[PDB]
Amino acid sequence: SKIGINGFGRIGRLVLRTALEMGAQVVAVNDPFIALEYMVYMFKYDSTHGMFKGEVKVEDGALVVDGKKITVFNEMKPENIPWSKAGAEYIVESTGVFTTIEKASAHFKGGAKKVIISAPSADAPMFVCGVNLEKYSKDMKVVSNASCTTNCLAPVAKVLHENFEIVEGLMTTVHAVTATQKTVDGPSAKDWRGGRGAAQNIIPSSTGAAKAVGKVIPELDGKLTGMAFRVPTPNVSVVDLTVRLGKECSYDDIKAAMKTASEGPLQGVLGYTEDDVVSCDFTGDNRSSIFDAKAGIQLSKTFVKVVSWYDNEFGYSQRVIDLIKHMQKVDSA
Amino acid sequence: SKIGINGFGRIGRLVLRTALEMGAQVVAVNDPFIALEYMVYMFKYDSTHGMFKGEVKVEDGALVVDGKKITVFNEMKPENIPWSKAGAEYIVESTGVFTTIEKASAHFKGGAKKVIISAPSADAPMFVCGVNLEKYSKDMKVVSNASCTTNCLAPVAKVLHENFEIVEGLMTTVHAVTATQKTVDGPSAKDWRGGRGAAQNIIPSSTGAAKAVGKVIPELDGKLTGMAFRVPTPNVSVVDLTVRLGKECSYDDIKAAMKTASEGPLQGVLGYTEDDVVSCDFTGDNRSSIFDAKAGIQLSKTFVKVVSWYDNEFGYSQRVIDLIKHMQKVDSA
Amino acid sequence: SKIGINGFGRIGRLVLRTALEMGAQVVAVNDPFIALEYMVYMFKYDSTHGMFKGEVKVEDGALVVDGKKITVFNEMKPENIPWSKAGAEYIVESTGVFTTIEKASAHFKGGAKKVIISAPSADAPMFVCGVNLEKYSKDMKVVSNASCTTNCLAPVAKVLHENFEIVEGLMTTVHAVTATQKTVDGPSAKDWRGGRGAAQNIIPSSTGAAKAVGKVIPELDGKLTGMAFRVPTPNVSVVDLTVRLGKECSYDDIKAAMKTASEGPLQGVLGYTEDDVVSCDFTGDNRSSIFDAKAGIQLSKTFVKVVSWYDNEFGYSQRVIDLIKHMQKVDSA
Amino acid sequence: SKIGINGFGRIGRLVLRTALEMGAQVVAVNDPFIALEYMVYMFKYDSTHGMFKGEVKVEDGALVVDGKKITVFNEMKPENIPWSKAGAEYIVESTGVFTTIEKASAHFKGGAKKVIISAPSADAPMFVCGVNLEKYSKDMKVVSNASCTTNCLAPVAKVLHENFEIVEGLMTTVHAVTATQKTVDGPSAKDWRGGRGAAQNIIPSSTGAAKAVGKVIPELDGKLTGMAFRVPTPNVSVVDLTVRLGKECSYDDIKAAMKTASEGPLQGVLGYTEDDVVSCDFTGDNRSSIFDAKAGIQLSKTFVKVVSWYDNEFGYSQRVIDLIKHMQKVDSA
Numbered sequence A, B, C, D: 001s002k003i004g005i006n007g008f009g010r011i012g013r014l015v016l017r018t019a020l021e022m023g024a025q026v027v028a029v030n031d032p033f034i035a036l037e038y039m040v041y042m043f044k045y046d047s048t049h050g051m052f053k054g055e056v057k058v059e060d061g062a063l064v065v066d067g068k069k070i071t072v073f074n075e076m077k078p079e080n081i082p083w084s085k086a087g088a089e090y091i092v093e094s095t096g097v098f099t100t101i102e103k104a105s106a107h108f109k110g111g112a113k114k115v116i117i118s119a120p121s122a123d124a125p126m127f128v129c130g131v132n133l134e135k136y137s138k139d140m141k142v143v144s145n146a147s148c149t150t151n152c153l154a155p156v157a158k159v160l161h162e163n164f165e166i167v168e169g170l171m172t173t174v175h176a177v178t179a180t181q182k183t184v185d186g187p188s189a190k191d192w193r194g195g196r197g198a199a200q201n202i203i204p205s206s207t208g209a210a211k212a213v214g215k216v217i218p219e220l221d222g223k224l225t226g227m228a229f230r231v232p233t234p235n236v237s238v239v240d241l242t243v244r245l246g247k248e249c250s251y252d253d254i255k256a257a258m259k260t261a262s263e264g265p266l267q268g269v270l271g272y273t274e275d276d277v278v279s280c281d282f283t284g285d286n287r288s289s290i291f292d293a294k295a296g297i298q299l300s301k302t303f304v305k306v307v308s309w310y311d312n313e314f315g316y317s318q319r320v321i322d323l324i325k326h327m328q329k330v331d332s333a
């Protein structure tokens, strides 16, 4: 696996935890802004996904988790990271700063062989496990895992589209509070609404997830768009998708299609439920998107509103490792 | 006005506050679960709408607000309340338990001329100020003022339908917590999701608002439907309407139809804004529906998503007094 | 173990989960207000302690958890519960209604052998594991496990008192939201502040925990008292104890005493930490009370403020089983 | 008044709002991180204190509030601001970055007569209206107004000390979230607990308030100390003071000393209440400290716990204008 992580942030730390679960191997981490003993603390304690059960300690300038030694670098510039030194080959780029092919290539300077951008990218090909891994080629050096929301929508859109055909659709993601928000009314020049107190408000916001689905599923390109609402919940969001279908159908055909997909080809990616669930029931859920059967409504044989849950960064993190696994498989074949 | 209120709850109490400003006259209140000295407290202090600025005190087994003497009864059953004794002709039924024409007719025993259900009714004619008040005739003894959400949607639907014709629409309301939810996971046999902790979850929920619009605007009957998401905010909700129009139009055309309506026929009922607003900016707002221009999005010339705000507690109260004033001008004409 | 539970509430359900963890045996449950299939749902999904990992299902009028069959009764009156038929001997009384020895004895009419009140009791002897179990005798038929807060304070007070002697102390428990609170301003005749919107306010409140410690540790009787503040957090509370000591000491002697106790005699009951913890780091913590070393302050050699965390009902639930285990040990000797 | 403000943040903005009511005169503002059209927005809309009722608009590169023309500068460094140009003599330093007499003296280059640090200073004389204003002399060029918490505590401490003598006390402040906290777990190298999600946790924190009272009331120097708990509320905090008095007294005696002080020497600064109040009942309150009689508790005749509220944003702002008015009456005398 020889995985390396650049940027020990919320995604970066969750990717590490996930790796330890799924048995993947992380050999080095790079973050110039977080001191070594502070990394231990941020990795150990997590307000949402709880206490890390296992041993975590600093030992000889390295981070030791459950006996596994992880080399730590503090380079501000990607080109200066000794990836090869630590034996890191597949780099998870999660700083949110080097998201373009050009910027991301600086990692090859240090010995890296592949770079996975854990965010949307203006030019790196984007992948959503279960939707388009068919497009991945061994000679792609830099790839993107899209966004948390795209990984939720894509699976659902794919199932709907391949069965009833999406003519057009509008989306709303009722989203949990994010790190770019503020506790109290403060300055946010790039997004005035985004600066208003997060715990007090419902905040209309943006999302590129709908457009992004147009890149992951080309036929849908230009047929979907959407927005978001930031609400005062700590974790877990939900996708409210309203679509106009090309084939007439009953809401039962839709539940059937989703259920079949979840047990078959999209198992582990798309979940299915008929229980009376609420956002908290999905904290720590592995799947990228869970179809809420009871929450959806159908107005006519071709006009329906479908609902799908997803744990923000947690399901996304499982997908990052999944993507790296598929890649290494195709890369060594 | 000679108004009487049954149910000194969130609405009952705010209708009184609103009445004291729009100059209406409340002469009697009735609530068994609230003692006289306790009413002084619940009316004076309000977590959401602030401390009441004015004099509120008990005097002669009566409630005295800024001089106004208000007779208080504590009956547990409607037909008991001696409305006639206090001189209460028009009754605001805001307990949420006697919503049908039958149950609400109880107040007639006490000597009440008319009854206004501050909630949707299964059989009492429903009204929405600015949308269908012309259908009200004096011979009507019991009327409904619909729900908070129907009052926000109807105005917006009227405008969209009158200008571009609504073919079909699906609505989602990101709603603030209500008195029927629970602070922590608790029992709610009729609505399992509804019993989940309201401070931690995004709770899918139902709503009849979209269908009710089918009763207020006959032409839209059966062309609208929706659902809700209960979020952790104390007050102020938003309607997310995804609609398919019959006439091709640009989003500028939609903004123009809205602004226009808010200056003429629906002024004071439908507001229009282009600011980067958030839910807290509407606490205490008098309008039934405030169109958020910047938040809306358009996919095609006939498929657009519209967003409108509403202070579910306050605005509805203002509309309750407004409905009574219209009724009395027609009843005494 | 032959444990039976009366009242499948928040405590009742957590006690069941805990029993399954600790390997205790629950053979029957009684709750007249919760339907059988609804019990499955409330046991499976928990907003705070998450999804129950394991199988849960209704089977032949019984509840089956991980293959273990649990008989379900729906008796409104304790005397009518067939405890003996289900083989239940130790009854966890968690309805909050039959908390006195007299009321609790009705369980013996159904065949029960012992009753543990999972709440304070006006007359049943009270126990706090690790503080006064020595006093328990096999012929006590009804006992109380005190409250969640007493189980947090008692351990800490015991360590402080036996080492430096508590002359007098005042306590404040900054407490998470409770089920007896309201989502929005509503009626609460027995507690006006307690009826104010829970998500919007800091609510001064009461606690009997200080007085109760006077019964668990007699020497401290009449030397402690306190209050509470209800804050908008879903789970986990913290005890802020200010005491005047009889022996002069340094804050280091205090940390030393707490650390020693946590590793020795109070292990599993009193935790100790020097990390920069926050309330969420304790969700799901087994201990009754965790001493926060860094949070405390000392003004003089005999005046100090000590801080201790506790997960509300979760640590308490582990203590209920612990108490039943000690009891059965002493009871069969 | 000729007031100028540096730092249009929560305080900067509220000081302007307060000034517009107490009739003070603000003639200039300065903030680099906020553009002119953005100031109109941040001042007009406020999540906590409501939408500003009045006219706010940009005009001639100037901010115009209800006619008042306010010159705007955007400098990044103090000594630059051309205060003299606008006619700003008294400067409210509310950036929180130039709190020392040295750093704050920068404003002197611009032609500023006096500077008031809207935060504690390490070396500028600290004042608390109603407690030590009699110690201010015109020869003072740079002064501090202490912190929100010191302003709540000092009044209460003065009264307790003057009447019963404070031997020693320990303070806990259950504080609302501030601009320096994070919405979700994020980096905060100088305060690890401080970086934890503010919407989910009770976060232990430090405070200098209790010691600062030692500087405002010299006699209490070294006899007071405390700490804080940051909770998920937008505004309004409470002081929980556990104090040991030198003279035996009853709680009635304490209530009487408080009520008395609030009608004479400390009226308008220290409030007194006996109602069942909660934090939201103090949003927008002008007083620095509101004594909550019902919440207090007494253990013995010399050991009592006192509780006092304060709207940390609003009340402090009012005190800032008050301090300037006192300074100008003395400066021009």
Ligand SMILES: NC(=S)c1ccc[n+]([C@@H]2O[C@H](COP(=O)([O-])OP(=O)(O)OC[C@H]3O[C@@H](n4cnc5c(N)ncnc54)[C@H](O)[C@@H]3O)[C@@H](O)[C@H]2O)c1
Pocket: B006, B007, B008, B009, B010, B011, B012, B030, B031, B032, B033, B034, B075, B076, B077, B078, B094, B095, B096, B097, B118, B119, B120, B146, B147, B148, B149, B178, B179, B312, B313, B316, C186, C187
């Ligand atoms: N608050 C919002 S947002 C809103 C908006 C639109 C419509 N409504 C509807 O208005 C109704 C009341 O809502 P609410 O104000 O939130 O309720 P809330 O529970 O706050 O108040 C209801 C009041 O009814 C009183 N009451 C109960 N039973 C009786 C009785 N038998 N006789 C006399 N009084 C009684 C009770 O003491 C309580 O204060 C419900 O049907 C709602 O669905 C609420």
Ligand SMILES: NC(=S)c1ccc[n+]([C@@H]2O[C@H](COP(=O)([O-])OP(=O)(O)OC[C@H]3O[C@@H](n4cnc5c(N)ncnc54)[C@H](O)[C@@H]3O)[C@@H](O)[C@H]2O)c1
Pocket: A186, A187, D006, D007, D008, D009, D010, D011, D012, D030, D031, D032, D033, D034, D075, D076, D077, D078, D094, D095, D096, D097, D118, D119, D120, D146, D147, D148, D149, D178, D179, D312, D313, D316
């Ligand atoms: N609300 C509470 S609790 C309270 C009470 C009393 C005092 N204070 C203190 O008052 C200070 C300001 O608080 P706040 O209002 O929350 O600040 P906040 O950070 O919200 O605003 C400060 C403003 O200063 C601006 N600024 C930064 N640097 C400069 C500069 N170099 N030149 C000119 N302008 C600049 C900046 O853009 C920002 O908008 C802090 O030190 C607080 O700790 C807070």
